[PDB]
Symmetry: C5
Subunit: 234 residues, 5 copies
C-alpha cells in the first residue's frame, strides 16, 4: 500500500480530474451566459426568398435554413468567444522579476555589482538568486528558474579557469546555455569572465565587477527600453 | 481570497472552457453542413446496385457506405480547407532581421535596402541584442511569435585566434533554432580577420549583407533562380 | 472582424474542431459495422462449450459471478468481435500501401559541379516508381532546415544531401557544423539522410574533382535504393561489401 | 492467436482503460466532497423597468454562483496537495567500469554521514560514453532528485574528446529534466604517479558529495560561499 | 480522390478510432467485474458532535488498478530482444564475433540485425530500432576512417548516437574501432572483433547481470589493447 502513493504522484491523477471538472463546470458555465444572456435579448425581431431551384433544392432550402439557425446559435457563440478574448489580452506587462544565477567555483562575487546597477535603474525589479558549484552546472539551474518563476531573462554569473585546456568548459557550458534559452524563449545573459584576461589579482577584480554591471545594464534595455540598443546598432 | 486569483491564472481554466465549448458549437455547425446538404441531395447518386440461407446487413451496408461518404466527404472538405489555408503560404507573411550591439558596421540597413527594392510587398521587423551569442532565443522568438518566415542573421565576429569559438558556438544555436522550427535563418556573419584596415572591412561588410538579402528574396519567391544557379 | 479572424488563425483551433467532429463520424461508423453486421451474426452460444454449473448448490451463499459471467461473457463476446474486425482492418492497411512516392534531393548554390542530375539519373533507373522533389538553397549551412521540411512537410521517406564543402584549413568547420544539423535533422525524425559531402581538397586540378564529385552521388543513390528497398543487399555487404 | 498479443501491447489499451475508468471514480470523488460538504452549510442560509429581464438576470447570477462552489472545491483539493517531505529524499550515484579508482564509496560515506535519511541508489556501466541514458533513466524513473557523474577520464591528447562528448549530453540530460547531474570527472593527466592520482581522486569524490548535501538542503551556504574560493579539487 | 488515401495514413485516423472504441469496451468490461462481480457478496476521528461511503467505494477501485498493474507486469520480463546494427563502410564484419558470444551467455536473446553505408547514418537507424521494436538496447559496431581529419566523424556520430540514447531510455553501445590502432591489416583485425565481443559481454550484463559490473567498480576493465588494471 505504501508503494501505491507513488502512482498518484508520478502520474498525478488528481491534477487531471480537477482540471476537467472545471472543464465541465467552467464550460457549462460560460454557456448559460450566452444561453441566458447574449442571445434572447441581442437577437429578437431582426430574407425574402423564393427562387429557381427545388424541390430537391427545397432540400437545399432546408439546408440554408439549418445553416442560418446554426449561425444564430453559432455567431452568438463566436461573439461570446470574442468577449472572452478581451479579458485574456488584459493582465500585466513589463514590470517583472529578473533572477541572477551564480558560481561557488568562481573567484569574484558579481551577484551585487549587477544587482545594484539594476535595482537602481528600476526599483520594481523583484530579484531572485540561486547558486551552483560548477561553471558547468548553472544551465539546468537558470532554466529551472526560467521554467518555474517568471525569471523573465537571467544572467550567467561566474568565472572560467586558466590553462590552454579549460577553454573547453566555456564552449561546453555555453552550448547548453544557448540551449536552455532555446528550450524556452528568453535570453539567458551569459556573464562570463575568463581569468587569463589579467596580469594579477587586482587587475582581474576590476574587470569582472565592471563587466558584471554593463550587462545588468543591457538587462534593463532588453527589459523595458528596446529602442536604445536599437539605436546602439559600432 | 486574494490567493485564489492565482490558481485561475497559472492553470488557465478559461482557455480550456472556451476551446471545448467552441468545439461543440464548431462541430454541431459543420455537421448539418452534411446532415442537411451534401447528403439530402447528393443522395440520388450511387445506390451502387449490387461478398463472403437464413439471413438486414445490406440495407445497413448501404447506410454505412453513405455515412462513409458523409465522413469521407467531410475529410475531403477538411483537406480543401487546409489547401486554402496553405494558399496563404503562396501569399507571404514577412522577413525578419536581427541585430547586434557588438557589431562594428551596421549591415541592417545595407540589407533592408536590397529587400524592399526587389519586392515592396515585404513588411520588415527589426529587433536588436548586445551579444553575438544571443541572436537565437530572439531569432526563434520572431519565428515563434510573429510570422517572419525567414530572418537575416545580422552580426560581426571577433578577432584573435581565440574568438573563432564564438562562430562555432553561435552557429549551432542557429541551425538549432533553425531545426527548432522550419525556417531558413541565413547566418550573416562577417569575421574581422578578413581585412587589413578599417575601410577595407567596411566595404566587405555591407556588400555581403546585400548578397544574402539578395538570396533572401530568392528563397522567398524565386526558388528556380537559385535552382539554375546550382553549378 | 479582421482582427478576430487573425485571432482565429495562428492557434489552429480548426484542427481540433475537425478532428473532434471526425472522431464522432469515425466512431459511430465502425460501431454500425458491429451493431448490425459482426454481432447480429455472432450470436448462438454454440458451437463451443465449457460454461459453468460448477456444483451450484447450497452455499449457504456464494455467487455473484454466474449471472455476471453470463452477462459479462456476453459483453466480452461483443467487444471481442469488435476487436477482431479492428485487427483485420489494420492488417488490410499494412498489406496495401506499398503504393509509395517520394525521395527528395536537396542541392547547393555553393557547389561548383551539379551533382543532383548525376544522382537523379541512376535513381529512377534503379526504379522508375520514384517521385523526385528537387529544391535548392544558397549556403551549404542551410540545407538542414530544408532537408527537414522535405522530410516533414511532404513524404520523402529519405533524401540526398548533394552538397559541396570548401578549401583552406579553416572552412573545415562548416562541414562539422553542417553534418551536426544533418544528424539533428536525421535525429529529429526517423528518415535516414545520406550526406553527399565531398571536400575540394580531394584533388589537384579541376577535372579530377569533377570525376570524383559525380562518381559519388551515384554511389550514394545506389545505397539510397537498397536503403529504401534492398536492406538484404547491404545486410551481406558488411565487411567491405 | 499468438499474433494478437501484439496489438494489446503496441497500443497499450489497458493504460487508457484504467486511467479512463479512474477519471470517473476520481471525479465523482471530488464531487461528493462539494455536493455534500463544502456547500450544505458553507453557503446555505446566506417591479422591473423590465422587458425580458429580471428573472433572466436573476437566473444568470444563480448559475454563476454554482460555478463559485466548484471553484471553491477546486481550491480545496489543490490546497490539500502538500509540499510535505519534499527535500528529505533519495540521492543515487552512477559509476564506471572503464574506471581505475572506486570513488563510488568515497562520497557515499561523507553523505549518509552528514545525513542518515538519504537512501542511496547505485548502478553502473562500461565506459564513460553511456552514463547519460543511465542518469536520465534514474533521474526519470525513480526520484534521485539529483545524481552524480562518478566516472573516470583518460590520457592521450586524443581521449580528451571523451569529456567533451559525454558532458554535452550530461548538460542535455540535465536540460531534458530539471535536475542537477553533478559531473564528477577526474582526468588522469592530473598526476605524476599511481598513488598521486588515487588521492586527488577519492578526495575529489567527497568534495562534491559535500555539495550534493548542500544543494539538497543547505542552499544559503553556497549562497554565502558565493564568489569566494572553493575550486572543488586539488 | 487518389490523394486522400494519404491523409488517412499520415494521421492514422483509424488506429485511434479503434483504440478509442476499445477503451469504452475495455472499461465497461472491468466495470461489470466490480459493479456486477466483486461488490455484491460483501455487505479516522472525533466529533460527536456519505463522503466516507463514496471514498470507501472509490478506495476499493484503487486497489483493482494495482492488481491490474501486477497482472500486466506478469506477462513478460527482462528476457528479450537485442537487435544489433552494424557498418557497411567497415573493414571487417564485427557483427559475428559478439553475435556469437551473445547467444552463448544465453540463448533467450532474439537478435535482429540491419545495416547502412556511411558511419554517420546509423544514428537514425539505431534510434529507429530502439523506438519501433523493443530493442531494449543495441550495439553499433562502427569503424572510422584514416587521416588526422576524419577523426571529426567519430565525434559527430557519437554525439548523435548520444542524443539517440538521450531521446530514449536505452543504452546504445557505441562500438567505434579506429584504424590508427594498428600497424598492418591482421593486427587491427584482432583488435577489432576482440573488442566487439568484450562489449557484447557487458551487454549480457547491462541487461540482466548488474551486480557483475557493480563489483568491477573502479577495477581495471579497459576494453581494448590489454586490459588496464585498477
Ligand atoms: C485540446 C483540448 C481537449 C481537452 C481534453 C478533451 C480532449 C478532446 C478529445 O476528443 C476526443 O477525440 C477523440 C479522437 O478522435 C475522439 O475519438 C473522441 O470522440 C473525442 O471525445
Amino acid at each position: 500500500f505504501s508503494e501505491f502513493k507513488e502512482f498518484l504522484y508520478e502520474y498525478k491523477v488528481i491534477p487531471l480530474a480537477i482540471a476537467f471538472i472545471m472543464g465541465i463546470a467552467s464550460t457549462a458555465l460560460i454557456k448559460s451566459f450566452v444561453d441566458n444572456i447574449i442571445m434572447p435579448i441581442i437577437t429578437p425581431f431582426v430574407e425574402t426568398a423564393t427562387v429557381e431551384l427545388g424541390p430537391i433544392v427545397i432540400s437545399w432550402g432546408a439546408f440554408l435554413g439549418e445553416l442560418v439557425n446554426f449561425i444564430i446559435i453559432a455567431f452568438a457563440v463566436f461573439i461570446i468567444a470574442k468577449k472572452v478574448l478581451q479579458e485574456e489580452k488584459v493582465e500585466k506587462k513589463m514590470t517583472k522579476k529578473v533572477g541572477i544565477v551564480d558560481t561557488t567555483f568562481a573567484r569574484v562575487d558579481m551577484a551585487s555589482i549587477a544587482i545594484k546597477k539594476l535595482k537602481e535603474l528600476s526599483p520594481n525589479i523583484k530579484i531572485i538568486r540561486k547558486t551552483v558549484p560548477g561553471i558547468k552546472d548553472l544551465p539546468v539551474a537558470c532554466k529551472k528558474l526560467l521554467e518555474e518563476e517568471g525569471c523573465d531573462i537571467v544572467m550567467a554569473l561566474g568565472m572560467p579557469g586558466k590553462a590552454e585546456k579549460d577553454k573547453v568548459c566555456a564552449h561546453e557550458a555555453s552550448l547548453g546555455l544557448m540551449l536552455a534559452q532555446l528550450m524556452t524563449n528568453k535570453h539567458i545573459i551569459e556573464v562570463f569572465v575568463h581569468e587569463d584576461e589579467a596580469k594579477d589579482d587586482k587587475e582581474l577584480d576590476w574587470l569582472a565587477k565592471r563587466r558584471a554591471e554593463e550587462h545588468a545594464e543591457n538587462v534593463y534595455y532588453l527589459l523595458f527600453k528596446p529602442e536604445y540598443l536599437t539605436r546602439m546598432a559600432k
